[PDB]
Amino acid sequence: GSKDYDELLKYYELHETIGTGGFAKVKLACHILTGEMVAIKIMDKNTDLPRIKTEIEALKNLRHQHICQLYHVLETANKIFMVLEYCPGGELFDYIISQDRLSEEETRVVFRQIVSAVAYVHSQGYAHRDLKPENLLFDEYHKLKLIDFGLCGSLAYAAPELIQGKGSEADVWSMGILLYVLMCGFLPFDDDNVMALYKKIMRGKYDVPKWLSPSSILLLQQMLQVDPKKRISMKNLLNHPWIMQDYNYPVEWQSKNPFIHLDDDCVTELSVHHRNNRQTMEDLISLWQYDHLTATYLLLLAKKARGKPVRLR
Template identity: 70%
Template structure:
């Protein structure tokens, strides 16, 4: 099979079941994007990896996928689905909006003993379960623990894990993991027991939580290794006797004198204030099948419960597995176990979706109909949107007179017919300054429509001529003839023709909503309102997107976000002043950077030009309190070196 066709199939499958949004994390060989599972409405994290870029790390990804398929625990990040092509791997994972535990430590400087105990009990629970399944993690550190929406920890990154064929008592030889968390026996090159090495790493992690820094640290690796092999470290004065004792018992140089995870479950320091050992068993083991979730899937798929159960029990980690696990997650959080109806697709109107491409310098945002929280607001509307909310015809229909386009209307995709002539007008070379188009036959771009009218008040501030009735649609454009350049007139002609063809659709849905008002329940009434508002706001976004006069190359100001663990608060209210102060300091710290608006992509290089550290600093405005903040994000390099460097930059900037 041709590579290109295989690539398209992978991206097509992803976008068939998920709405994909902006990048929320990135690393050396992967990007993580926020997504939403269409059928359940649940947010997910989508990890996108290019096999060519992975190189020698590809086996590590395979190991991680295999391990996560076999693990199901309340404190282990859940894998929902894997999509693999000849060139790419997509991993659909549990979304943890709280970010890394590492950022939480930085924000708090250090944690209290009480809060540390809450987190550490969860870490012990996760590790006891992982070990019970025969795995050693071998890369335990704050960067590999995420905080979910309920402020609970989720263990991630099983790329270095090992599952010895002879069981956990079987000795391993591979030296791996982060040096600062590595056990002495690994550094010495001796054979070691994976579970014992994990306990040492847990001790280092516990010290970092209680103290805000590492017990063994040095810029010189050889000096660091000598410190670890001696096992000597200084206890700060604020540590309680109980904390000092458990740390000493976990960070024993001799692994046979070290505490085991089983001993940690009911250790006096761990059970203090709880009066009960740590519960480590999985609340939802993979063998358990939830009847409510199966019933909902069976109804939605029009299958029997027996055949649906058999399908789920195959655990293929395809869309069926993802749907079941996400329904189960909804039930556990007290949400209704319901699936949205699948989008109504007109005959042969869907085309294969373009493969997702990304590079180090490009964060291609794929906007969907998710009502994003304000920390994800991006004020720059000039994004080419082809994947979500609007579909064009397949290649086989490129010569047809009419093109079938689909726009999400709140119930499903409603069909809009656009003549090929209209499309040709949009593709003229004069339109290049408005939208980046592809060389092949191009679908008409349209921004996807929000499912709820929650943001209508905000939109009303910027767009006074919000489309309210079908008869007003054309007037909303014609009333401002001077608002566009001559080069944009053809775009507006396309919009007008689209609006005219949508009038009947909108009137139909309005009447349907009115018909439902007397017969349906309150939920149906609300749904009809959401649909109609979505159509109107969507058309308004199309006008904004295709009108040259509204184009803005850069944001008018910094992004507005909520306070997060990776945001440093300043005492200033002028973002430009904060940005200039940081810009003046970076050269002094030998930090190279590129600037894009209020975001600085920074990096440091070694003696031979190799990038040793990469991170982002973004000047932003916080909503509450209304002050300037600096968002920090580590992209590459040692986490604690990054911490010291960023703290040095921000303190020297006097912000």
């Protein structure tokens, strides 16, 4: 009887509704061809348009093993549907509060996935501008994926010039706020009034607790430079000693999930399902229109790395 869930329910089986906040709620669901669990961000357009499409059109052109992958895309008459990677681990935010502060070791593993994500985003020419621990999840395998692109509670991680409206280096500051929140358990510049914080952010003076490594403070000092030209570049960030402390080899920000290389095993299987020549489907898949076929393929080689047999229904 669903009037708007026509197309969706033809390709997915609905499950437990999550995310309820009027503006958007995410319901997990099962891709029936692949039997693979997905999350679907449901938004009606009665409660904006461009900010969302700026996120979706970004996500259309970025693929990376630490960005929450976007599959099919669907727009109803008064609704919009986005299916994305399954991220049951939850926010890194709650993961922070789970165990008070985070060890330098544990903070190092989380953070290097973050830089590899953000360093790849910058290669393609985008900046996320809104980096908060509420915007990065854990997949089924404790890998980290970033969401809520949108811009391409959110002021504390904002760079000084981002409040000045005066360009990728705003994230290097945001990641510096992240790391401080990671190893400790609190923010560099927070307080109850927004007026006082603007002052503290432009002032750039923040405390430094007991437990922090002499290697950390250096890195944060290079990251929390109100001078964006004196802020540390992404190039030096990928080779930095704190980042190469134990885990000792360059941050592999190179996307291992490509727009260019189509896995044969998945495309051979996909062609027998549609009754096409394999060469015919390969070019068709490379369109990446983010309709059903793209969802089927990208959850098929995902099913492959999952270890499952590469089958449909």
